[PDB]
Amino acid sequence: IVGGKVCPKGECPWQVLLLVNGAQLCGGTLINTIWVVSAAHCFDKIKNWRNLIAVLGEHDLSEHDGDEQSRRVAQVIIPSTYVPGTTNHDIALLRLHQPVVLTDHVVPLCLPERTFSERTLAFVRFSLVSGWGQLLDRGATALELMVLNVPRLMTQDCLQQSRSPNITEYMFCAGYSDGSKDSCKGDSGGPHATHYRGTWYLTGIVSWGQGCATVGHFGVYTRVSQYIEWLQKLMRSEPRPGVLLRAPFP
Amino acid sequence: LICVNENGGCEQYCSDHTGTKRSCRCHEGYSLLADGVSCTPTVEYPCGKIPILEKRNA
Ligand SMILES: O=C(NCc1cccc(-n2ncc(-c3cc4cnccc4[nH]3)c2O)c1)Nc1ccccc1
Ligand SMILES: [Ca+2]
Ligand SMILES: [Cl-]
Ligand SMILES: [Cl-]
């Protein structure tokens, strides 16, 4: 996160850290005790699935404070329509090996109903994006969880205001064109969370693209509303042997 | 009331029904109040609420 601030400990309780062989991979979003939403691209290069760990209740990576909860990942589910190393359909559903325990520091983000998301949430201007990603383009990653308020653009407006992969119906633009504020490498998979009448909801996933905080460009986010039904169906399904699962989309 | 407008007055989820009918609903871990619009937590850690903040104002 570029141009944000530290998310005070416990104020981003749905934020997940994904590690591979102990190394920072990506972010994620807790949506219930055993389910995490992330970005498909995070998993493009994974060799050994057994080395993938999700951490809840994380804040300051430099220390252990006892609020952290680590889990193995039992399943990584990606849409059939996702092509590695691209942007479209950049979403993943992760099943944890064991539930996290909800605490003051570990709380799921609400996965909204599609109708609600489309009719209401999509029109809330500002939303929060978070992670332990790069603090600057070509800079070091964050030791403390960062958060940033970004405004959402209608796709038409995004295109106009821009000055590259396409912007599809499965994405949206948010942020700033002035190169001051963005999500960045290390943040992918993390939440774009939207507040409505006292409750927060998952509306986007930090995806990727062309540099971070690049002048003339906006951040690209996976449009979660397009995937609600897909996610819900999967969450009702029994696990299958072998971590990686490609599931038909729609 | 219609769901497309002002969320049908619902705090959370909204369904249109046959007629000038509407039903609000709430996410798991919440219940709908008698106003037919408001949602109240039924569990300690409902989704999309920040405990340290909820407490900060409790
Ligand atoms: O290498 C793979 N995936 C492996 C992977 C794992 C974990 C993180 C990454 N990764 N790299 C850059 C970014 C990134 C930039 C960026 C800018 N703004 C906002 C968010 C952003 N995220 C990112 O999240 C890639 N895929 C791949 C490639 C090329 C060809 C085929 C597949
Ligand atoms: Ca820590
Ligand atoms: Cl099944
Ligand atoms: Cl496997």
mmCIF file of C-alpha atoms and ligand atoms in Angstrom:
data_model
loop_
_atom_site.group_PDB
_atom_site.id
_atom_site.type_symbol
_atom_site.label_atom_id
_atom_site.label_comp_id
_atom_site.label_asym_id
_atom_site.label_seq_id
_atom_site.Cartn_x
_atom_site.Cartn_y
_atom_site.Cartn_z
ATOM 1 C CA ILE A 1 0.000 0.000 0.000
ATOM 2 C CA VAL A 2 1.254 3.352 -1.238
ATOM 3 C CA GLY A 3 0.123 6.543 0.437
ATOM 4 C CA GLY A 4 -1.915 4.908 3.151
ATOM 5 C CA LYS A 5 -1.583 4.576 6.882
ATOM 6 C CA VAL A 6 -1.141 1.894 9.472
ATOM 7 C CA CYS A 7 -4.345 -0.001 10.086
ATOM 8 C CA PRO A 8 -4.578 0.173 13.872
ATOM 9 C CA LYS A 9 -4.187 -3.294 15.287
ATOM 10 C CA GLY A 10 -7.528 -5.055 15.230
ATOM 11 C CA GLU A 11 -9.232 -2.586 12.891
ATOM 12 C CA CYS A 12 -8.649 -4.813 9.899
ATOM 13 C CA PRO A 13 -9.527 -8.141 11.513
ATOM 14 C CA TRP A 14 -10.501 -9.902 8.287
ATOM 15 C CA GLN A 15 -7.084 -9.360 6.702
ATOM 16 C CA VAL A 16 -5.153 -12.516 5.896
ATOM 17 C CA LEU A 17 -1.439 -12.958 5.233
ATOM 18 C CA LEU A 18 -0.453 -15.777 2.892
ATOM 19 C CA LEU A 19 3.006 -17.287 3.242
ATOM 20 C CA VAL A 20 4.935 -19.786 1.186
ATOM 21 C CA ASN A 21 7.892 -21.377 2.944
ATOM 22 C CA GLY A 22 7.514 -18.578 5.442
ATOM 23 C CA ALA A 23 7.839 -15.871 2.819
ATOM 24 C CA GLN A 24 5.186 -13.243 2.106
ATOM 25 C CA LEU A 25 3.131 -14.231 -0.929
ATOM 26 C CA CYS A 26 -0.093 -12.284 -0.900
ATOM 27 C CA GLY A 27 -3.020 -11.138 1.115
ATOM 28 C CA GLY A 28 -6.473 -12.540 1.580
ATOM 29 C CA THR A 29 -9.858 -11.937 3.148
ATOM 30 C CA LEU A 30 -11.514 -14.062 5.789
ATOM 31 C CA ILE A 31 -15.236 -14.566 4.996
ATOM 32 C CA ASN A 32 -15.931 -17.200 7.579
ATOM 33 C CA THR A 33 -14.046 -19.461 9.924
ATOM 34 C CA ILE A 34 -12.642 -21.778 7.239
ATOM 35 C CA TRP A 35 -12.880 -19.690 4.066
ATOM 36 C CA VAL A 36 -10.536 -17.114 2.641
ATOM 37 C CA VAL A 37 -10.850 -15.177 -0.589
ATOM 38 C CA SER A 38 -7.679 -14.205 -2.433
ATOM 39 C CA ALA A 39 -6.385 -13.636 -5.976
ATOM 40 C CA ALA A 40 -5.836 -16.474 -8.414
ATOM 41 C CA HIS A 41 -2.532 -15.107 -9.664
ATOM 42 C CA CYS A 42 -1.008 -15.560 -6.249
ATOM 43 C CA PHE A 43 -0.868 -19.259 -6.961
ATOM 44 C CA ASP A 44 0.439 -19.294 -10.499
ATOM 45 C CA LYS A 45 3.909 -20.483 -9.508
ATOM 46 C CA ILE A 46 3.261 -22.654 -6.500
ATOM 47 C CA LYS A 47 5.298 -25.809 -6.606
ATOM 48 C CA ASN A 48 4.497 -27.444 -3.331
ATOM 49 C CA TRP A 49 1.017 -26.734 -1.992
ATOM 50 C CA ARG A 50 1.987 -28.013 1.451
ATOM 51 C CA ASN A 51 4.114 -24.973 2.032
ATOM 52 C CA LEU A 52 1.152 -22.600 1.905
ATOM 53 C CA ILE A 53 0.066 -21.023 5.164
ATOM 54 C CA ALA A 54 -2.636 -18.511 6.028
ATOM 55 C CA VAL A 55 -2.235 -16.206 8.993
ATOM 56 C CA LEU A 56 -5.061 -14.390 10.737
ATOM 57 C CA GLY A 57 -4.762 -11.737 13.434
ATOM 58 C CA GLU A 58 -1.473 -10.521 12.027
ATOM 59 C CA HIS A 59 -0.398 -6.918 12.398
ATOM 60 C CA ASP A 60 3.303 -6.317 12.948
ATOM 61 C CA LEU A 61 5.361 -8.879 11.101
ATOM 62 C CA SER A 62 8.392 -8.166 13.248
ATOM 63 C CA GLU A 63 6.841 -9.620 16.345
ATOM 64 C CA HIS A 64 4.686 -12.273 17.887
ATOM 65 C CA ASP A 65 1.978 -11.030 20.195
ATOM 66 C CA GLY A 66 -0.188 -14.092 20.472
ATOM 67 C CA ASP A 67 -3.179 -12.858 18.509
ATOM 68 C CA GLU A 68 -1.865 -14.563 15.354
ATOM 69 C CA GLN A 69 -3.439 -17.756 14.123
ATOM 70 C CA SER A 70 -1.809 -19.839 11.426
ATOM 71 C CA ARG A 71 -3.512 -22.464 9.320
ATOM 72 C CA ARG A 72 -2.630 -24.855 6.560
ATOM 73 C CA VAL A 73 -4.512 -24.512 3.316
ATOM 74 C CA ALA A 74 -6.531 -27.575 2.351
ATOM 75 C CA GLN A 75 -7.885 -26.282 -0.935
ATOM 76 C CA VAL A 76 -7.206 -23.552 -3.450
ATOM 77 C CA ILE A 77 -10.106 -23.100 -5.820
ATOM 78 C CA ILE A 78 -9.802 -21.079 -8.971
ATOM 79 C CA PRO A 79 -12.298 -20.352 -11.762
ATOM 80 C CA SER A 80 -11.940 -22.362 -14.915
ATOM 81 C CA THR A 81 -11.942 -19.108 -16.851
ATOM 82 C CA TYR A 82 -8.811 -17.760 -15.179
ATOM 83 C CA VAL A 83 -5.645 -17.824 -17.235
ATOM 84 C CA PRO A 84 -2.353 -17.734 -15.355
ATOM 85 C CA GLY A 85 -0.425 -14.519 -15.530
ATOM 86 C CA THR A 86 -3.471 -12.475 -16.400
ATOM 87 C CA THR A 87 -6.040 -10.228 -14.757
ATOM 88 C CA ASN A 88 -9.487 -11.522 -15.740
ATOM 89 C CA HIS A 89 -11.204 -13.710 -13.156
ATOM 90 C CA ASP A 90 -8.398 -13.076 -10.669
ATOM 91 C CA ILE A 91 -10.019 -14.753 -7.706
ATOM 92 C CA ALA A 92 -9.376 -17.736 -5.469
ATOM 93 C CA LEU A 93 -11.302 -19.453 -2.714
ATOM 94 C CA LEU A 94 -9.180 -21.057 -0.031
ATOM 95 C CA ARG A 95 -10.333 -23.655 2.443
ATOM 96 C CA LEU A 96 -8.370 -23.783 5.692
ATOM 97 C CA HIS A 97 -7.389 -27.129 7.198
ATOM 98 C CA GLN A 98 -8.909 -26.106 10.492
ATOM 99 C CA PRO A 99 -11.181 -23.173 11.374
ATOM 100 C CA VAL A 100 -9.735 -20.017 12.809
ATOM 101 C CA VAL A 101 -11.150 -19.022 16.190
ATOM 102 C CA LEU A 102 -13.021 -15.738 16.091
ATOM 103 C CA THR A 103 -11.614 -13.150 18.465
ATOM 104 C CA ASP A 104 -11.354 -9.419 18.825
ATOM 105 C CA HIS A 105 -8.505 -9.711 16.319
ATOM 106 C CA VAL A 106 -9.951 -12.274 13.935
ATOM 107 C CA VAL A 107 -13.316 -11.555 12.345
ATOM 108 C CA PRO A 108 -14.745 -12.362 8.907
ATOM 109 C CA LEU A 109 -15.769 -9.755 6.362
ATOM 110 C CA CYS A 110 -19.327 -10.202 5.146
ATOM 111 C CA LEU A 111 -19.687 -11.721 1.720
ATOM 112 C CA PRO A 112 -22.706 -9.826 0.417
ATOM 113 C CA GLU A 113 -25.638 -11.003 -1.618
ATOM 114 C CA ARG A 114 -25.148 -10.224 -5.274
ATOM 115 C CA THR A 115 -28.209 -8.048 -5.580
ATOM 116 C CA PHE A 116 -27.220 -5.966 -2.597
ATOM 117 C CA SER A 117 -23.688 -5.643 -3.850
ATOM 118 C CA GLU A 118 -24.760 -4.574 -7.311
ATOM 119 C CA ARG A 119 -27.593 -2.305 -6.367
ATOM 120 C CA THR A 120 -26.137 -0.698 -3.282
ATOM 121 C CA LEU A 121 -22.503 -1.401 -2.477
ATOM 122 C CA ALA A 122 -21.358 -0.646 -5.997
ATOM 123 C CA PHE A 123 -22.415 2.952 -5.426
ATOM 124 C CA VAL A 124 -20.617 3.591 -2.199
ATOM 125 C CA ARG A 125 -17.808 5.864 -3.358
ATOM 126 C CA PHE A 126 -15.029 5.016 -0.957
ATOM 127 C CA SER A 127 -13.724 1.716 0.263
ATOM 128 C CA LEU A 128 -10.709 0.428 2.130
ATOM 129 C CA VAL A 129 -7.865 -1.618 0.734
ATOM 130 C CA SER A 130 -5.205 -3.155 2.922
ATOM 131 C CA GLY A 131 -2.019 -5.162 3.034
ATOM 132 C CA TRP A 132 1.648 -5.584 3.780
ATOM 133 C CA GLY A 133 2.663 -4.773 0.240
ATOM 134 C CA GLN A 134 5.209 -2.317 -1.108
ATOM 135 C CA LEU A 135 5.034 1.133 0.456
ATOM 136 C CA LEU A 136 6.393 2.555 -2.768
ATOM 137 C CA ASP A 137 6.920 1.530 -6.334
ATOM 138 C CA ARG A 138 10.181 -0.369 -6.335
ATOM 139 C CA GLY A 139 10.265 -0.122 -2.566
ATOM 140 C CA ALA A 140 10.282 -2.273 0.538
ATOM 141 C CA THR A 141 7.197 -3.971 1.894
ATOM 142 C CA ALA A 142 5.442 -2.956 5.072
ATOM 143 C CA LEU A 143 6.126 -4.413 8.495
ATOM 144 C CA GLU A 144 2.808 -3.121 9.851
ATOM 145 C CA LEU A 145 -0.528 -3.676 8.106
ATOM 146 C CA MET A 146 -1.474 -0.686 5.979
ATOM 147 C CA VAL A 147 -4.798 0.610 4.839
ATOM 148 C CA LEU A 148 -5.993 3.032 2.198
ATOM 149 C CA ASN A 149 -9.268 4.719 1.302
ATOM 150 C CA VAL A 150 -9.885 4.561 -2.456
ATOM 151 C CA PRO A 151 -12.735 5.825 -4.609
ATOM 152 C CA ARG A 152 -14.422 3.592 -7.085
ATOM 153 C CA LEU A 153 -14.825 4.478 -10.704
ATOM 154 C CA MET A 154 -17.469 3.481 -13.175
ATOM 155 C CA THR A 155 -15.652 1.583 -15.853
ATOM 156 C CA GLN A 156 -16.507 4.104 -18.519
ATOM 157 C CA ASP A 157 -14.988 6.810 -16.409
ATOM 158 C CA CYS A 158 -11.991 4.714 -15.628
ATOM 159 C CA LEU A 159 -11.183 4.383 -19.260
ATOM 160 C CA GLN A 160 -11.615 8.049 -19.911
ATOM 161 C CA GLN A 161 -9.572 9.158 -16.970
ATOM 162 C CA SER A 162 -6.792 6.811 -17.832
ATOM 163 C CA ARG A 163 -3.623 7.862 -19.577
ATOM 164 C CA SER A 164 -2.669 -2.163 -20.873
ATOM 165 C CA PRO A 165 -5.056 -4.993 -20.090
ATOM 166 C CA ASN A 166 -8.706 -4.378 -20.639
ATOM 167 C CA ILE A 167 -11.204 -3.543 -18.029
ATOM 168 C CA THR A 168 -13.827 -6.204 -18.121
ATOM 169 C CA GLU A 169 -17.116 -6.666 -16.398
ATOM 170 C CA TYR A 170 -15.253 -8.844 -13.938
ATOM 171 C CA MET A 171 -13.189 -5.953 -12.741
ATOM 172 C CA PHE A 172 -13.338 -2.448 -11.511
ATOM 173 C CA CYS A 173 -11.090 0.535 -11.113
ATOM 174 C CA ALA A 174 -10.387 2.335 -7.905
ATOM 175 C CA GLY A 175 -7.897 4.796 -6.568
ATOM 176 C CA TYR A 176 -6.027 7.726 -8.000
ATOM 177 C CA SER A 177 -4.339 8.727 -11.217
ATOM 178 C CA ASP A 178 -1.791 11.052 -9.653
ATOM 179 C CA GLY A 179 0.562 8.349 -8.536
ATOM 180 C CA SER A 180 0.176 9.092 -4.850
ATOM 181 C CA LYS A 181 -2.016 6.280 -3.665
ATOM 182 C CA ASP A 182 -2.469 2.648 -4.649
ATOM 183 C CA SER A 183 -2.213 -0.977 -3.737
ATOM 184 C CA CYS A 184 0.961 -2.648 -4.845
ATOM 185 C CA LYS A 185 2.907 -5.867 -5.125
ATOM 186 C CA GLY A 186 2.505 -7.785 -1.915
ATOM 187 C CA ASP A 187 -1.081 -6.616 -1.488
ATOM 188 C CA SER A 188 -2.685 -8.816 -4.107
ATOM 189 C CA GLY A 189 -5.477 -10.939 -2.806
ATOM 190 C CA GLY A 190 -6.319 -8.538 -0.069
ATOM 191 C CA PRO A 191 -9.686 -6.927 0.601
ATOM 192 C CA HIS A 192 -11.448 -4.010 -0.900
ATOM 193 C CA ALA A 193 -14.012 -3.516 1.858
ATOM 194 C CA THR A 194 -17.086 -1.384 1.669
ATOM 195 C CA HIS A 195 -19.055 0.102 4.535
ATOM 196 C CA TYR A 196 -22.821 0.280 4.558
ATOM 197 C CA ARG A 197 -24.991 1.194 7.467
ATOM 198 C CA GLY A 198 -22.564 0.060 10.102
ATOM 199 C CA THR A 199 -21.300 -3.108 8.492
ATOM 200 C CA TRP A 200 -18.448 -3.943 6.154
ATOM 201 C CA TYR A 201 -18.631 -6.090 3.047
ATOM 202 C CA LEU A 202 -16.302 -7.647 0.500
ATOM 203 C CA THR A 203 -16.583 -5.854 -2.832
ATOM 204 C CA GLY A 204 -13.170 -6.289 -4.389
ATOM 205 C CA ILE A 205 -9.956 -8.242 -4.405
ATOM 206 C CA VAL A 206 -6.617 -6.549 -5.039
ATOM 207 C CA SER A 207 -5.591 -7.893 -8.415
ATOM 208 C CA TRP A 208 -2.689 -6.621 -10.473
ATOM 209 C CA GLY A 209 -1.334 -4.709 -13.345
ATOM 210 C CA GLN A 210 1.071 -2.139 -14.610
ATOM 211 C CA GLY A 211 3.308 -0.869 -11.881
ATOM 212 C CA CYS A 212 2.044 0.528 -8.665
ATOM 213 C CA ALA A 213 1.007 4.124 -8.130
ATOM 214 C CA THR A 214 1.710 4.767 -11.782
ATOM 215 C CA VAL A 215 0.630 8.177 -12.942
ATOM 216 C CA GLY A 216 -2.282 8.051 -15.307
ATOM 217 C CA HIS A 217 -3.486 4.739 -13.978
ATOM 218 C CA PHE A 218 -5.904 3.351 -11.474
ATOM 219 C CA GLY A 219 -5.839 0.232 -9.358
ATOM 220 C CA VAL A 220 -7.549 -2.844 -10.700
ATOM 221 C CA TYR A 221 -9.776 -4.962 -8.520
ATOM 222 C CA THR A 222 -11.672 -8.167 -9.075
ATOM 223 C CA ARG A 223 -15.396 -7.459 -9.004
ATOM 224 C CA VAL A 224 -16.504 -9.824 -6.277
ATOM 225 C CA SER A 225 -20.195 -9.418 -7.052
ATOM 226 C CA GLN A 226 -19.717 -11.461 -10.205
ATOM 227 C CA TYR A 227 -18.555 -14.400 -8.097
ATOM 228 C CA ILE A 228 -20.945 -14.539 -5.170
ATOM 229 C CA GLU A 229 -22.959 -17.437 -6.443
ATOM 230 C CA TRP A 230 -19.829 -19.264 -7.520
ATOM 231 C CA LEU A 231 -18.304 -18.818 -4.069
ATOM 232 C CA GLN A 232 -21.460 -19.779 -2.253
ATOM 233 C CA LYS A 233 -21.822 -22.969 -4.205
ATOM 234 C CA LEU A 234 -18.241 -23.951 -3.524
ATOM 235 C CA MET A 235 -18.618 -23.258 0.201
ATOM 236 C CA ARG A 236 -21.407 -25.831 0.259
ATOM 237 C CA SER A 237 -19.267 -28.475 -1.427
ATOM 238 C CA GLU A 238 -17.165 -31.250 0.041
ATOM 239 C CA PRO A 239 -13.377 -30.974 -0.205
ATOM 240 C CA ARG A 240 -11.584 -32.930 -2.874
ATOM 241 C CA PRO A 241 -8.189 -34.573 -2.737
ATOM 242 C CA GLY A 242 -5.420 -32.447 -4.066
ATOM 243 C CA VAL A 243 -5.060 -28.835 -3.028
ATOM 244 C CA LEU A 244 -5.592 -27.127 -6.361
ATOM 245 C CA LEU A 245 -9.076 -27.263 -7.776
ATOM 246 C CA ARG A 246 -10.244 -25.630 -10.950
ATOM 247 C CA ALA A 247 -13.986 -25.126 -10.737
ATOM 248 C CA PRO A 248 -16.253 -24.206 -13.623
ATOM 249 C CA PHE A 249 -17.228 -20.623 -13.965
ATOM 250 C CA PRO A 250 -19.929 -19.507 -14.065
ATOM 251 C CA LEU B 1 -40.709 -0.081 -1.586
ATOM 252 C CA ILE B 2 -38.258 -1.484 -4.046
ATOM 253 C CA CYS B 3 -34.879 -2.920 -3.397
ATOM 254 C CA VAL B 4 -33.170 -0.975 -6.140
ATOM 255 C CA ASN B 5 -34.065 2.213 -4.410
ATOM 256 C CA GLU B 6 -32.445 3.088 -1.150
ATOM 257 C CA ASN B 7 -31.925 -0.607 -0.649
ATOM 258 C CA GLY B 8 -35.616 -0.897 -0.089
ATOM 259 C CA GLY B 9 -34.993 0.645 3.279
ATOM 260 C CA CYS B 10 -33.238 -2.535 4.386
ATOM 261 C CA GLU B 11 -30.116 -2.384 6.534
ATOM 262 C CA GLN B 12 -28.706 -5.403 4.721
ATOM 263 C CA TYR B 13 -30.326 -7.674 2.122
ATOM 264 C CA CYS B 14 -33.547 -7.019 0.205
ATOM 265 C CA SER B 15 -35.986 -9.086 -1.805
ATOM 266 C CA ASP B 16 -38.758 -7.810 -4.006
ATOM 267 C CA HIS B 17 -41.978 -9.733 -4.008
ATOM 268 C CA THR B 18 -45.067 -9.974 -6.083
ATOM 269 C CA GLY B 19 -46.826 -6.745 -5.496
ATOM 270 C CA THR B 20 -45.939 -3.721 -3.458
ATOM 271 C CA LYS B 21 -44.119 -6.252 -1.332
ATOM 272 C CA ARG B 22 -40.616 -6.323 0.040
ATOM 273 C CA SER B 23 -38.724 -8.460 2.518
ATOM 274 C CA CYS B 24 -35.493 -7.519 4.194
ATOM 275 C CA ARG B 25 -33.069 -10.095 5.406
ATOM 276 C CA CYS B 26 -29.935 -10.328 7.488
ATOM 277 C CA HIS B 27 -26.657 -12.173 7.143
ATOM 278 C CA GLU B 28 -25.958 -15.171 9.290
ATOM 279 C CA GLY B 29 -25.123 -14.039 12.806
ATOM 280 C CA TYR B 30 -27.783 -11.362 12.693
ATOM 281 C CA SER B 31 -31.500 -11.203 13.196
ATOM 282 C CA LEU B 32 -34.136 -8.896 11.718
ATOM 283 C CA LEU B 33 -35.902 -6.559 14.093
ATOM 284 C CA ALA B 34 -39.621 -5.971 14.247
ATOM 285 C CA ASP B 35 -39.179 -2.815 12.132
ATOM 286 C CA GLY B 36 -38.602 -5.317 9.357
ATOM 287 C CA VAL B 37 -35.469 -3.488 8.220
ATOM 288 C CA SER B 38 -32.839 -3.485 10.961
ATOM 289 C CA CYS B 39 -30.323 -6.201 11.706
ATOM 290 C CA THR B 40 -28.909 -6.938 15.115
ATOM 291 C CA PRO B 41 -26.045 -9.316 15.954
ATOM 292 C CA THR B 42 -26.906 -12.657 17.482
ATOM 293 C CA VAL B 43 -23.340 -13.758 18.006
ATOM 294 C CA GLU B 44 -20.192 -12.387 19.595
ATOM 295 C CA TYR B 45 -18.286 -11.874 16.373
ATOM 296 C CA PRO B 46 -20.660 -11.151 13.540
ATOM 297 C CA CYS B 47 -19.165 -10.498 10.120
ATOM 298 C CA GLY B 48 -18.214 -7.003 9.092
ATOM 299 C CA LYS B 49 -18.048 -5.525 12.558
ATOM 300 C CA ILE B 50 -14.857 -4.408 14.296
ATOM 301 C CA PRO B 51 -14.875 -5.530 17.939
ATOM 302 C CA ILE B 52 -12.441 -2.989 19.352
ATOM 303 C CA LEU B 53 -14.519 -0.250 17.784
ATOM 304 C CA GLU B 54 -17.887 -1.690 18.699
ATOM 305 C CA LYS B 55 -16.644 -1.823 22.249
ATOM 306 C CA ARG B 56 -15.136 1.615 21.971
ATOM 307 C CA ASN B 57 -18.660 2.888 21.565
ATOM 308 C CA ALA B 58 -20.538 0.401 23.685
HETATM 309 O O1 LIG C 1 4.183 -15.180 -11.593
HETATM 310 C C1 LIG C 1 2.957 -15.312 -11.525
HETATM 311 N N1 LIG C 1 2.332 -15.412 -10.335
HETATM 312 C C2 LIG C 1 3.096 -15.428 -9.090
HETATM 313 C C3 LIG C 1 2.896 -14.282 -8.141
HETATM 314 C C4 LIG C 1 2.706 -14.586 -6.796
HETATM 315 C C5 LIG C 1 2.557 -13.555 -5.881
HETATM 316 C C6 LIG C 1 2.584 -12.242 -6.294
HETATM 317 C C7 LIG C 1 2.783 -11.950 -7.643
HETATM 318 N N2 LIG C 1 2.812 -10.633 -8.076
HETATM 319 N N3 LIG C 1 3.772 -10.090 -8.974
HETATM 320 C C8 LIG C 1 3.473 -8.839 -9.178
HETATM 321 C C9 LIG C 1 2.328 -8.510 -8.407
HETATM 322 C C10 LIG C 1 1.615 -7.228 -8.330
HETATM 323 C C11 LIG C 1 1.861 -6.081 -9.024
HETATM 324 C C12 LIG C 1 0.852 -5.109 -8.612
HETATM 325 C C13 LIG C 1 0.561 -3.784 -8.927
HETATM 326 N N4 LIG C 1 -0.465 -3.171 -8.366
HETATM 327 C C14 LIG C 1 -1.244 -3.770 -7.480
HETATM 328 C C15 LIG C 1 -1.026 -5.082 -7.100
HETATM 329 C C16 LIG C 1 0.024 -5.784 -7.677
HETATM 330 N N5 LIG C 1 0.505 -7.048 -7.537
HETATM 331 C C17 LIG C 1 1.943 -9.660 -7.742
HETATM 332 O O2 LIG C 1 0.898 -9.819 -6.899
HETATM 333 C C18 LIG C 1 2.929 -12.972 -8.571
HETATM 334 N N6 LIG C 1 2.159 -15.366 -12.606
HETATM 335 C C19 LIG C 1 2.602 -15.286 -13.928
HETATM 336 C C20 LIG C 1 3.386 -14.238 -14.377
HETATM 337 C C21 LIG C 1 3.784 -14.218 -15.705
HETATM 338 C C22 LIG C 1 3.412 -15.246 -16.555
HETATM 339 C C23 LIG C 1 2.629 -16.293 -16.105
HETATM 340 C C24 LIG C 1 2.224 -16.317 -14.782
HETATM 341 CA CA CA C 2 2.648 -10.128 14.817
HETATM 342 CL CL CL C 3 -20.213 -31.795 -3.280
HETATM 343 CL CL CL C 4 -1.852 -31.572 -3.675
#
